[PDB]
Write an enzyme that holds these catalytic residues in place. Structure first.
Site, PDB file in Angstrom:
ATOM      1  N   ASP A 351       7.248 -32.979 -38.099  1.00 33.09           N
ATOM      2  CA  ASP A 351       8.548 -32.727 -36.867  1.00 33.09           C
ATOM      3  C   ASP A 351       9.680 -33.056 -36.398  1.00 33.09           C
ATOM      4  O   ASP A 351       9.553 -34.680 -36.626  1.00 33.09           O
ATOM      5  CB  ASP A 351       7.673 -32.026 -35.470  1.00 33.09           C
ATOM      6  CG  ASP A 351       8.380 -31.878 -34.709  1.00 33.09           C
ATOM      7  OD1 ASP A 351       9.385 -31.745 -33.605  1.00 33.09           O
ATOM      8  OD2 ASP A 351      10.294 -30.815 -35.341  1.00 33.09           O
ATOM      9  N   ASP A 703       5.683 -31.843 -31.983  1.00 32.02           N
ATOM     10  CA  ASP A 703       5.277 -31.547 -30.500  1.00 32.02           C
ATOM     11  C   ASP A 703       5.677 -30.314 -29.729  1.00 32.02           C
ATOM     12  O   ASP A 703       6.237 -30.172 -28.870  1.00 32.02           O
ATOM     13  CB  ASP A 703       6.504 -32.808 -29.603  1.00 32.02           C
ATOM     14  CG  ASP A 703       8.150 -32.039 -29.712  1.00 32.02           C
ATOM     15  OD1 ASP A 703       8.442 -31.845 -30.682  1.00 32.02           O
ATOM     16  OD2 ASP A 703       8.895 -32.475 -29.191  1.00 32.02           O
ATOM     17  N   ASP A 707       5.889 -26.183 -34.163  1.00 31.05           N
ATOM     18  CA  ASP A 707       4.652 -26.693 -34.911  1.00 31.05           C
ATOM     19  C   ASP A 707       2.912 -26.813 -34.853  1.00 31.05           C
ATOM     20  O   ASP A 707       2.394 -26.971 -35.675  1.00 31.05           O
ATOM     21  CB  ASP A 707       4.949 -28.308 -34.164  1.00 31.05           C
ATOM     22  CG  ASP A 707       6.234 -28.777 -33.954  1.00 31.05           C
ATOM     23  OD1 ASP A 707       7.031 -28.702 -35.469  1.00 31.05           O
ATOM     24  OD2 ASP A 707       6.499 -29.189 -33.611  1.00 31.05           O
TER      25      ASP A 707
HETATM   26  F1  ALF Z   1      12.012 -30.916 -35.996  1.00 37.86           F
HETATM   27 AL1  ALF Z   1      11.606 -29.663 -34.582  1.00 37.86          AL
HETATM   28  F2  ALF Z   1      10.718 -28.448 -34.098  1.00 37.86           F
HETATM   29  F3  ALF Z   1      11.932 -30.327 -33.124  1.00 37.86           F
HETATM   30  F4  ALF Z   1      11.416 -28.199 -35.200  1.00 37.86           F
HETATM   31 MG   LIG Z   2       9.994 -31.423 -31.910  1.00 36.34          MG
END
Ligand code: ALF
Ligand SMILES: [Mg+2]
Ligand SMILES: C/C=C(/C)C(=O)O[C@H]1C(C)=C2[C@H]([C@@H]1OC(=O)CCCCCCC)[C@@](C)(OC(C)=O)C[C@H](OC(=O)CCC)[C@@]1(O)[C@H]2OC(=O)[C@@]1(C)O
EC number: 7.2.2.10
Length: 994
Positions: A351, A703, A707
């Site tokens: 992520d 996080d 995800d």
């Molecule tokens: F980069 Al993210 F949920 F924090 F896709």
């Molecule tokens: Mg994130």
């Protein structure tokens, strides 16, 4: 209603036949409630207490060791009074261990948090609807809301269901859709249709998604779908339908016992062929009822000798200890079996926000005009350090520290950022850190003003609580914010009306401070401020400004840029119509351009390095984010996923783009692309799955709630310690430290552990080989039982169970993290190692049987019985003539069996030293390197004595201590093993490979 985002407000009302003004009738509600069910996520309770156990036995090797346990009890009756003192000691310890691990087994698994539980915490208990039932808005149980309901949401509200927005009451509706995007930034909704029927969530700006929350505004909408038919429902469904796959090691074991069941079944029938020479002779000394007892007994022997029981306890021990070790490294492991799989990782999907980045908007660049003169216009550019919301950092002019207060333009720039702001900062005393209050892009502005301290306010002695808004308050004292002209979609800017502090309502000197998208703002500027003076905006100046805005907005930094301006002579308070926003842009006219700030969510300091280390270990890193492509690619270059100037046209995609490629293309895309942006929750799990379709062990790290599906799907889901509960409860590991670096140390720990598990997996299985070789010999060779199936258990639980756990401590290599991920298929035993253990295998088989047949023929205190009358030891009380010498009760004597067990044990106590390295001579690799192994062999030998002396023991084991005359013999029959394997360890390392 499917695809409500692609239809108009009228079309949606029509679809359910409802009035925006009255809402559903009590009938409509009952009919819909029955047709669609309740607006609720089906709760999923974990397996019952009874299931957990049963699942425990589901294992083949466990069900085979259970069957033998029964046959060991069915024939536990057939026995006389010679040994009627210990007849069920076997059927006891056989099911004791079975229920021992079974019970303990559930003591680890039944202790787990449920992810859907955590997820349903985003479901509000209450909702607000307009039912024809009555005039005013009713506040009811969210679960009682149905498609077609006319719902109302207000700031602070947690959206009850997937809703098509009907009417926006305020000037704007701001929403936080982080549960679906991982981005906390406020999304500005609208009511117009969004044509594309394949629009991703980020694109449906006319929809409200259940589980999200209103950041600002008031709106009225119509429910499109509820329950599992929502975006949060898809997340819920991907988590329900999961069941993590069996680790690569567990498959090798499931494969092993898959064959063990075949080999043993085949060995039994094998010996049967060697029992046809007694079936011919017409004798009635053993009926068929009796004749079968022989086989059922030899079978239970082979099973207990084959199934390397005790291993299931050796593994759990190594892992448990490893987990404690990793915890020290800030890596909480929630699933022991994953520790092994983490070392076998080839791809890490990650992520971005709050994982690769800090998730704290920071202003890192800003400029004001230096000097103007005809076609010449120079800017004063500055840079600001700091990646968090903390008021810690400095302003740099040419990389050299300066005092903002010196530049008058920065005094005005800071004034606008402090006044034209609805947010603030706060120090969380409990957590010891500074946090935002309100919007992130606004708090970055608050933080910048504290760093600039343009009035040189004395802040070093203030408490951190009071340091948070010190400089902002100073500025708030100079100008009074009468009112603010809220942001407007057709303006892309916002402004605040301020009057000098301590002046009359009629006084002169009012100002409007504007903040917004550079294009619109700069276009409404007719002047440019220079220090404290002001000159006309001209084509040259405008182009200079817009040129730098363009560089900053799309480069290796791709920053969010804001133009700051002020209206030096705003309209008179009176002549302004605040209740009509379409009149605001005209109020925000004849502006003086002042400056520009540039912001972005920085990467974490230790991420570029961590990814380079991963690369060294042959692990690739991919980014999958819900944020936009432009900033996703920028961050990728900043951390090393892409080269500063690498061409990425085909190496980066948005969810929508990805959805367009056909299946085969999508697959290939996961092998070539390293950046996936503006994706939805299910896009992340699909990418992980594609990666797995190439048989790669994939880790996923994130996080957010979005995800979760991917974290669940990955072989190793890794959540951020300071991230959502949903992410955590769906992961195999949590980085309490929030550092990517920790992941690297976890992979290293993962590689080392498996290496050690590899040895004692061989050691134990190896032992079990020599045992089967024995039972096989003394089965088709006629000889009495050199070792009963009631002794093997203790050996494979305490005798070997100790050296095993000791091997799990072998010192790891140095090049451990310089080699590529090992294949999931890489077999434990094959090639020369299959043969090397084959020799040692048969050896121990005859090494024990030899010591048994030795206590007879070439013996001392035993009848020098001839080999022939030894193999025919049966015909004693039936054929006295031919076979005769001493008593017929010297076979079941506690000497021959107590002579083979000493060998087996002495051998395995030597084999544990042979397992200290694959192709390494014990002489070259000191057998004393592992002090825990030496001390381990001691406790085993001591327990081999204790199982003799203390009578209460050798009674059930049917054993009798040996003296020098006999013990000295064992040392000379087992000790030669440090030779066979010793010569073999030389062959491979000098005639194969190293
Ligand atoms: F980069 Al993210 F949920 F924090 F896709
Ligand atoms: Mg994130
Ligand atoms: C418990 C004890 C024993 C002796 C057993 O039956 O193990 C066999 C067996 C099932 C395999 C074999 C054993 O097979 C033989 O030794 C051939 C037959 C000779 C027996 C003669 C009768 C006295 C393993 C043990 O050993 C050797 C020394 O050759 C190696 C390996 O195992 C592994 O890689 C370990 C997996 C945890 C497996 O061929 C494996 O089958 C597989 O699927 C594998 C791929 O797994």
């Amino acid at each position: 209603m499917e695809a409500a985002h692609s239809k108009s407000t009228e079309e949606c009302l029509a679809y359910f036949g409802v009035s925006e003004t009255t809402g559903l009738t009590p009938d409509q509600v009952k009919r819909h409630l029955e047709k669609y069910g309740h607006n609720e996520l089906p709760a999923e309770e974990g397996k019952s207490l009874w299931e957990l156990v049963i699942e425990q036995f589901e294992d083949l090797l466990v069900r085979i060791l259970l069957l033998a346990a029964c046959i060991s009890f069915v024939l536990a009756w057939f026995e006389e009074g010679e040994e009627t003192i210990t007849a069920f000691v076997e059927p006891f310890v056989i099911l004791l261990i079975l229920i021992a691990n079974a019970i303990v087994g559930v003591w680890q698994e039944r202790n787990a948090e449920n992810a859907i539980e955590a997820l349903k915490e985003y479901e509000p208990e209450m909702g607000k609807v307009y039912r024809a039932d009555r005039k005013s808005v009713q506040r009811i149980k969210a679960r009682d809301i149905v498609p077609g309901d006319i719902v109302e949401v207000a700031v602070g509200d947690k959206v009850p269901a997937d809703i098509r927005i009907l009417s926006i009451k305020s000037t704007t509706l701001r929403v936080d859709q982080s549960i679906l995007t991982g981005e906390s930034v406020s999304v500005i909704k609208h009511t117009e249709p969004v044509p594309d029927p394949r629009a991703v969530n980020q694109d449906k700006k006319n929809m409200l998604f259940s589980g999200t929350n209103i950041a600002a505004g008031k709106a009225l909408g119509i429910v499109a779908t509820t329950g599992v038919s929502t975006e949060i429902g898809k997340i819920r469904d991907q988590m329900a339908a999961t069941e993590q796959d069996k680790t690569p090691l567990q498959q090798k074991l499931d494969e092993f016992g898959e064959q063990l069941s075949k080999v043993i079944s085949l060995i039994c029938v094998a010996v049967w062929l060697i029992n046809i020479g007694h079936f011919n002779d017409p004798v009635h000394g053993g009926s068929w009822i009796r004749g079968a007892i022989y086989y059922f007994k030899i079978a239970v022997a082979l099973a207990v000798a084959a199934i390397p029981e005790g291993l299931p306890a050796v593994i759990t021990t190594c892992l448990a200890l490893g987990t404690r070790r990793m915890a020290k490294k800030n890596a909480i492991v929630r699933s022991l079996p994953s520790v092994e799989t983490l070392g076998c990782t080839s791809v890490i999907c990650s992520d971005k926000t709050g994982t690769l980045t800090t998730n704290q908007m920071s202003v890192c660049k800003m400029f004001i005009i230096d000097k103007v003169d005809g076609d010449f216009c120079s800017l004063n550019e500055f840079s600001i350090t700091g990646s968090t919301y903390a008021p810690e950092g400095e302003v740099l002019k040419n990389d050299k520290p300066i005092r903002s207060g010196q530049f008058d333009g920065l005094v005005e720039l800071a004034t606008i950022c402090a006044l034209c702001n609805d947010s603030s900062l706060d120090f969380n005393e409990t957590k010891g850190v500074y946090e935002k209050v309100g919007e992130a892009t606004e708090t970055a502005l608050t933080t910048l003003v504290e760093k600039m301290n343009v009035f040189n306010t004395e802040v070093r002695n203030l408490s951190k609580v009071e340091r948070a808004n010190a400089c902002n308050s100073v500025i708030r004292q100079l100008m009074k914010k009468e009112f603010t002209l809220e942001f407007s979609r057709d303006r892309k800017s916002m402004s605040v009306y301020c009057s000098p502090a301590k002046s009359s309502r009629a006084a002169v000197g009012n100002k409007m401070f504007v903040k917004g998208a550079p294009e619109g703002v700069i276009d409404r500027c007719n002047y440019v401020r220079v220090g404290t003076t002001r000159v006309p905006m001209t084509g040259p100046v405008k182009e200079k400004i817009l040129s730098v805005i363009k560089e900053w907005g799309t480069g290796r930094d791709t920053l969010r840029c804001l133009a700051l301006a002020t209206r030096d002579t705003p309209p008179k308070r009176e002549e302004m119509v605040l209740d009509d926003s379409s009149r605001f842009m005209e109020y925000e006219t004849d502006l003086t351009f002042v400056g520009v700030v540039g912001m972005l969510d920085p990467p974490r300091k230790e991420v570029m390095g961590s990814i380079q280390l991963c690369r060294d270990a042959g692990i690739r890193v991919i980014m999958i984010t819900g944020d936009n492509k432009g900033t996703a690619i920028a961050i990728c270059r900043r951390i090393g996923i892409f080269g500063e100037n690498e061409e990425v046209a085909d190496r980066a995609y948005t969810g929508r783009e990805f959805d367009d490629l056909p299946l085969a293309e999508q697959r290939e895309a996961c092998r070539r692309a390293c950046c996936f942006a503006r994706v939805e929750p299910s896009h992340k799990s699909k990418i992980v799955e594609y990666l797995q379709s190439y048989d790669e062990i994939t880790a996923m790290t994130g996080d957010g709630v979005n995800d979760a599906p991917a974290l669940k799907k990955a072989e190793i889901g890794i959540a951020m310690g300071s991230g959502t509960a949903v992410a955590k409860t769906a992961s195999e590991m949590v980085l309490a430290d929030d550092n990517f670096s920790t992941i690297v140390a976890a992979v290293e720990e993962g590689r080392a552990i498996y290496n050690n598990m590899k040895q004692f997996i061989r050691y134990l299985i190896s032992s079990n080989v020599g045992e089967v070789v024995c039972i096989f010999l003394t089965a088709a060779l006629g000889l009495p039982e050199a070792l009963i199936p009631v002794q093997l258990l203790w050996v494979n639980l305490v005798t070997d169970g100790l050296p095993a756990t000791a091997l799990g401590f072998n010192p790891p290599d140095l090049d451990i993290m310089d080699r590529p991920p090992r294949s999931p298929k890489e077999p434990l035993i094959s090639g020369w190692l299959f043969f090397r253990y084959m020799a040692i295998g048969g050896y121990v088989g005859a090494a024990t049987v030899g010591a048994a047949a030795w206590w007879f023929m070439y013996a001392e205190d035993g009848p020098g019985v001839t080999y022939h009358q030894l193999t025919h030891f049966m015909q004693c009380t039936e054929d006295h003539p031919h076979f005769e010498g001493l008593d017929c009760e010297i076979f079941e004597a506690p000497e021959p069996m107590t002579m083979a067990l000493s060998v087996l044990v002495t051998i395995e106590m030597c084999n544990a030293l042979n397992s200290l390295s694959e192709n390494q001579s014990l002489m070259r690799m000191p057998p004393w390197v592992n002090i825990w192994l030496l001390g381990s062999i001691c406790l085993s030998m001591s327990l081999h004595f204790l199982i003799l002396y203390v009578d209460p023991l050798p009674m059930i084991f049917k054993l009798k201590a040996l003296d020098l005359t006999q013990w000295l013999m064992v040392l000379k029959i087992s000790l030669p093993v440090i030779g066979l394997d010793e010569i073999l360890k030389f062959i491979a390392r000098n005639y194969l490979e190293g």
